[PDB]
Structure formats: structure tokens, C-alpha cells
């Protein structure tokens, strides 16, 4: 169906201590496939999925040089931002970058992304038209002016509209088995008496891919937002994910409550009850 590729860069300055730490990971959908860490004993782009190991030595060597050059570029960016914000060179700062492409079922670019954060806040982002920028503050407007004067969005658009979509398609073809799969959750409802008047129902979803999922508790057909405890979707470590949703219910009314599970790998949304 629909798929995406994302690169996530993190650079953190270490003034007084020389060069910034630069770390890159790349994902297809919810599967990490490459990583780079400038602080490694011998920094290289490294495979993180089996379907990417097919790439020849030229793939790894050139991507490695690309990350090393990017780290030097991010060093200058970091220096610049410190000036824009007239921040002393004592503390450490974080530049994050996230870019990539979404493809629909036919293969066409659905959406391009290319955005940046500084110290954990939105800095500048390429607009959905891939021809303009949104700056977050007046410092980001400096960058915006430089980049619109230099037609920077055209270079980003070129990548997002060609190379990004093309390599994504190739990764999807090399890893069809793994990547095109939708693993449905394994589900059950557990029940724990709390007191003589209350009980916890917990609805579990285990072992699913991709990560996107909806878990809903309903009472007589009404969502229980205020009374539902949800955990963030979490990785199991074997390229699957887990989630649970819990509600506290009056003991003796557990049968009014149903857990609804929506996941791409399910034939149809599950409805689960607790069965004593």
C-alpha cells in the first residue's frame, strides 16, 4: 500500500571539546535499515535490516562519506545558530533534521518532508509544496532568506521527488517479504480485581507490525477517554510492537465493556470482551 522513507539526523555540539556528535538512522516505514555514528571507533554507515545487506561496497563507502561531510556541515550550522541566539559557547546544543518521502500504492510521491529543530523546538520546515519554507522565529527567518535566495527548496524537492522515491521503491522490492507484510496483533483482555467494588480490564495487543494501531475501550458503545489508561506503543525488540489500554470498571459490570482493535494487518477490526 502506502509507504515512506525517513532519515533522522541528530547533531549535538560539544564546544571546548572540539567536534559535534553526529548520528543518523534511516527507516522504511517502521523498520530501521541503516545507522551512522560519528563517535564510533571506525564510523561507517551500517546495515540494520537483512534486505539492505545486498547493497554493494560502493553503497556503504559513499553513504559513509556523505554522513562525515554532513557532520562537518552540521558543525557550521551549529556555530551559526549559536550566533543567531547569542548563546555562549559553554553549553551543548542539539540540531535535529528529518526528511524523506511518502509514496502511495501506485508509486507516486504523496508527500515530501524536510524539517529541522534546534534544542528540541521547530526551527524551519519545507512546506508541503516543496517550494517554500515556514520559519518558527526571527532567527529561522535568517535561514529562510538565505535559502530562498539560493533556491534551496529546489534541491530538496529534486531529491524528494526523484532519488528518495526511487531508492524507497528499490528497498520495497528487495525486502518485499518483510516490508510489505502486515502482522496483526495477538490480542487478549485481562482482568484484575482492585477492591470489592472495582476491577481493571486491560486490553493487550502484541506482536504487530507496523506500529500504527488504535485500541479503544467502549461502554455500551461510547469511548472511555477520561477513564482509559493507555501506554505508548512500544517495540518488543524483534521488529514488532506492543500496546495496551486499561479501564477501571465497577465489579459486576465488566460485560458492558468492549475493547476495539484496529490494525492494518487485521481482516476487520476486532471487538474483544472479557470472558470469565
Amino acid at each position: 500500500g502506502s509507504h515512506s522513507m525517513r532519515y533522522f539526523y541528530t547533531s549535538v555540539s560539544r564546544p571546548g571539546r572540539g567536534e559535534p556528535r553526529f548520528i543518523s538512522v534511516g527507516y522504511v516505514d517502521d523498520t530501521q535499515f541503516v545507522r551512522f555514528d560519528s563517535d564510533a571507533a571506525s564510523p561507517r554507515e551500517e546495515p540494520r535490516a537483512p534486505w539492505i545487506e545486498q547493497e554493494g561496497p560502493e553503497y556503504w563507502d559513499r553513504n559513509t562519506q556523505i554522513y562525515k561531510a554532513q557532520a562537518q556541515t552540521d558543525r557550521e550550522s551549529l556555530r551559526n545558530l549559536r550566533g543567531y541566539y547569542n548563546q555562549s559557547e559553554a553549553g551543548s546544543h542539539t540540531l535535529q533534521s528529518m526528511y524523506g518521502c511518502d509514496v502511495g500504492p501506485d508509486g507516486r510521491l504523496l508527500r515530501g518532508h524536510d524539517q529541522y529543530a534546534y534544542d528540541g523546538k521547530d526551527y524551519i520546515a519545507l512546506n508541503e509544496d516543496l517550494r517554500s519554507w515556514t520559519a518558527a522565529d526571527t532567527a529561522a527567518q535568517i535561514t529562510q532568506r538565505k535559502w530562498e535566495a539560493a533556491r534551496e527548496a529546489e534541491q530538496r524537492r529534486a531529491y524528494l521527488e526523484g532519488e528518495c522515491v526511487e531508492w524507497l521503491r528499490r528497498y520495497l522490492e528487495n525486502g518485499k517479504d518483510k516490508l510489505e507484510r502486515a502482522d496483526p496483533p495477538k490480542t487478549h483482555v485481562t482482568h484484575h480485581p482492585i477492591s470489592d467494588h472495582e476491577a481493571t480490564l486491560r486490553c493487550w495487543a502484541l506482536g504487530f507490525y507496523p506500529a500504527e494501531i488504535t485500541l479503544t475501550w467502549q461502554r455500551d458503545g461510547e469511548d472511555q477517554t477520561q477513564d482509559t489508561e493507555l501506554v505508548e506503543t512500544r517495540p518488543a525488540g524483534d521488529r514488532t510492537f506492543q500496546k495496551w489500554a486499561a479501564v477501571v470498571v465497577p465489579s459486576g459490570e465488566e460485560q458492558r465493556y468492549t475493547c476495539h482493535v484496529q490494525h492494518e494487518g487485521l481482516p476487520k477490526p476486532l471487538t474483544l470482551r472479557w470472558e470469565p
Binding site: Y7, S24, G26, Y59, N63, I66, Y67, A69, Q70, T73, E76, S77, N80, L81, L95, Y99, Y116, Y123, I124, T143, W147, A150, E152, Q155, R156, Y159, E163, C164, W167
Partner: peptide
């Protein structure tokens, strides 16, 4: 595979 972005902030 990654983009080459020498543009500076």
C-alpha cells in the same frame, strides 16, 4: 539512501 545537503543553517 541519504541526501547530500551542504547548505548551512
Amino acid at each position: 539512501r541519504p541526501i547530500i545537503r551542504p547548505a548551512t543553517l
